[PDB]
Design a binder for these strands. Structure first.
Ligand code: MG
Lengths: 95, 98, 106, 82, 95, 106, 87, 97
DNA sequence: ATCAATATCCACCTGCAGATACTACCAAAAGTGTATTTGGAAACTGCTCCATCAAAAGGCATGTTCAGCTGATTCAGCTGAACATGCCTTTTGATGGAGCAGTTTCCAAATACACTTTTGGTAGTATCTGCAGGTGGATATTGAT
DNA sequence: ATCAATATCCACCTGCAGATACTACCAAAAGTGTATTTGGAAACTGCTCCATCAAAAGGCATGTTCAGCTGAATCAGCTGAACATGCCTTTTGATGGAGCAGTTTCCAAATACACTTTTGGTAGTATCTGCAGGTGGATATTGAT
């Protein structure tokens, strides 16, 4: 009965923006969920350590940013950082 | 009477199983091995079906990986025939051993 | 009521991510932007992989992505492969590859 | 006709794995060598899995137990939860 | 002049118990400090995860204990688990 | 007023281990048994290493343990070697070991 | 500031004899002549990796000084944990 | 005029360096390499001396370990001479490449 | 080369295992209004870190010499690849019930807060002691003969 | 074997850096003692989903045959080890200057927290279809001759 949360729907929305006439199997979706959780934990984990190394009590977008730079390969890292910066900007400039 | 030369079917099998993704160990004998092994850590244990599958996916992935590294070791020694010394050398360099 | 995801231009649940950060014992406190940033990053990465796995599906004359398509996409990209270098994708198999010295001579 | 469980991992199955891993020709000593490796792998993962199970006061090994075991053995698996 | 703390002193006590006539260089003590911090994090960390996996919000001696069985190899785990258990038991009946 | 160490029968600081478990953000709450158990495992492990290093010191005719003696201890003990198998001990060197084929004659 | 010498080709400071000594410690009896450039290249990649991460910690903390701790944290991330310099 | 045969000194060096723990790379040259490389990532950086020593301990430990694995790879090929292909195979199986 | 055996590819067909779609709650995001908490922005220290200069040795660069290792070549013998099939082991699908998971309860044990006490860190001076690096000089080890 | 060159060993011996020793200040812990909150163990039990097993399914054990791979043996070429020789660069240890880590004290902004609305996201249920297999026939590949 109790709710079992997953990303399997945001994943689907993005699937559509990217490949509108393309679907996805249940297993493939399991793999996407594992992915998202994994990367979540890795990035959140580095953020955590960063904050702790610098005696701060707060994980801010800077920690997430530095953490991305440390965890992702070059090109991915670059693009990711700009995406993540664009989204904050768009959220800040939004009364 | 028709007969393929040694290595021709081998290559054929390489192409076939590199295309596909099905598990390559029969489920039941695997499942028994899991249970046999788990018995020494705790008695009267039951296994979700997906748990045993997770295990099998992981072993076969691991073993197929090891065979790649093993093959490179055989080739390194200018052979084409994987041997125990090749599996041992690969495991050693991976840091699973010695 | 506007969702933070919608404010930030995102399909990925900014609120949920905030909650997951709070209740993962990662830090005492969590800035406002962080979960938006993080959400974005996870969306971006998701899209890259779906894009490339989509193409993989297309190449094989198919409309539905399966694990095999994710595997081919990931292992055929220098960067994703590295990011996912210690990860096993169930039901992905491997890339067709045969050492040249094993091919038949004549 | 009684038989060992490890021997249920048969010569042809081991041969199929080797083929998926790109192997052309195989020494006859491999099959026992492989069985021993497989056994160590499974011992290590199951030992940790079951330790998860026990911690959770259960008598059923769940996939998540296995997934977490794989994770901390540096063999992260995707598609069975987590 | 800010207090930089370390295990250098407990380490020395324990040194004197096992080897009463033996000293230790400050570089050797540097290493023993690294060791303690390392194994602290690795146990605390497994525990963190282990509680989180079981939707518990508290790390008890029981989480540490599993943490230890998961982290240490065979015989070391066995002995570490005795001494833990022994300390906790003794501690419990000392108030 | 008795220290918790002494209560528990330990040289290693329970008070301090409790505190580090808090500020390290490992969980919301920490049970009173945790620091006690953890402190004791830590002490056990350091006693194990120091016992083995002390012996290396003595074997090399030395009174004071240095990093080489810690390395010889760890690398020569199968279970310490595995526990610390991805760790580098500064100024420890390596175990003397020469592959047999490399030696002279037959 | 006034000047600051241009650093170039310092990888060649990792000399053939220093590399041989390292090989010896590794138990190597005989060394082909091409080892030395290969070793220099592998070393360069290792350093770049550790230093990028170390400098990344440095920059994150808004310092201009790379600390032993920055290096220790970078080494840990890379799965080359080091004992003897803090942390 | 006296001569040790090829290999004899090599084994002597192996015994010697396996016995000691000093760094085998000269300090100053390694310090420059660090500074040169760091500089390419970022100008106007300074280094605690202990950072450069930490780096040098890490590098030497890595390289010696890589040579052990390399040596195993040569001896697998029935040679006693390490060659680049041995380093390359070691690093592949290590998952560095 | 030619020629047959057999694998492989491609078009087309189709039932249904497994997607996609829809509904309708409702836990959990978002909105609102205080109640803390924090990370700087300025404003100073005392450091470590950089630079540089001189002296000195200790190790590096180089060229010569040839020992013995590597890789090419040949080859014989062993050892794994290929092969047909019914015996038997696994796969498949049907059915009790073990136990995971839902839910509620309540107190043993957790945090919180304000005192009180104690210890572990450093800094100032002082002493000490292990052993690094130097010295012969007695005991191997290696390689020519 | 025997002999000579030279590396190795070991043990004793003085200078001294690094270690141990107080001494003493003290600030930050750690402890102690109520007041307050609650996480999770305990106990009951609903209902998945797991072990078992009967019939249906199709992969593997087997023994023979010989293609071709591995390892042994031989050897010519040349690479890499050893060593002598000439001196550059690293090491060591000063000295000065300052660029900058590291604190401390005030707040303005930012984040948590308790309390209400107001959905977006899930499980349960209902349609919809991609494609896994099947066949049929053409063509490519391999291996014999
Ligand atoms: Mg430059």
């Amino acid at each position: 009965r109790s709710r079992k949360e997953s990303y399997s729907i945001y994943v689907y929305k993005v699937l559509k923006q990217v490949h509108p006439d393309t679907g996805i199997s249940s297993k493939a979706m399991g793999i996407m969920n594992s992915f998202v959780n994994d990367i979540f934990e890795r990035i959140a984990g580095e953020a955590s350590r960063l904050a702790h190394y610098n005696k701060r009590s707060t994980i801010t977008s800077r920690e997430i940013q530095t953490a991305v730079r440390l965890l992702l390969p070059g090109e991915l890292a670059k693009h990711a950082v700009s995406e993540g910066t664009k989204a904050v900007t768009k959220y800040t400039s939004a009364k | 009477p028709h007969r393929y030369r040694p290595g021709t079917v081998a290559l054929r099998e390489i192409r076939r199983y590199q295309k596909s993704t099905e598990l390559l160990i029969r489920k039941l004998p695997f499942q028994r091995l899991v249970r046999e092994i788990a018995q020494d850590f705790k008695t009267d244990l039951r296994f979700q079906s997906s748990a045993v599958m997770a295990l099998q996916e992981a072993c076969e992935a691991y073993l197929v990986g090891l065979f790649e590294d093993t093959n490179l070791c055989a080739i390194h020694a200018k052979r084409v025939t994987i041997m125990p010394k090749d599996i041992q050398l690969a495991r050693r360099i991976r840091g699973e051993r010695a | 009521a506007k969702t933070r995801s919608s404010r930030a231009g995102l399909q990925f649940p900014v609120g949920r991510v905030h909650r997951l950060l709070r209740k993962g014992n990662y830090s005492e406190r969590v800035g406002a932007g962080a979960p938006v940033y993080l959400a974005a990053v996870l969306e971006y990465l998701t899209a890259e992989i779906l894009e490339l796995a989509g193409n993989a599906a297309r190449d094989n004359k198919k409309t539905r992505i399966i694990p095999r398509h994710l595997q081919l996409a990931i292992r055929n990209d220098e960067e994703l492969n590295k990011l996912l270098g210690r990860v096993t994708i169930a039901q992905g198999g491997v890339l067709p590859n045969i050492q040249a010295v094993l091919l038949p001579k004549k | 006709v009684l038989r060992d469980n490890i021997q249920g991992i048969t010569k042809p199955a081991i041969r199929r794995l080797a083929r998926r891993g790109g192997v052309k020709r195989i020494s006859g000593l491999i099959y026992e060598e492989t069985r021993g490796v497989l056994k160590v792998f499974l011992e290590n993962v199951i030992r940790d899995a079951v330790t998860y199970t026990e911690h959770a006061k259960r008598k059923t090994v769940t996939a998540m137990d296995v997934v977490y075991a794989l994770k901390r053995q540096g063999r992260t698996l995707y598609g069975f939860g987590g």
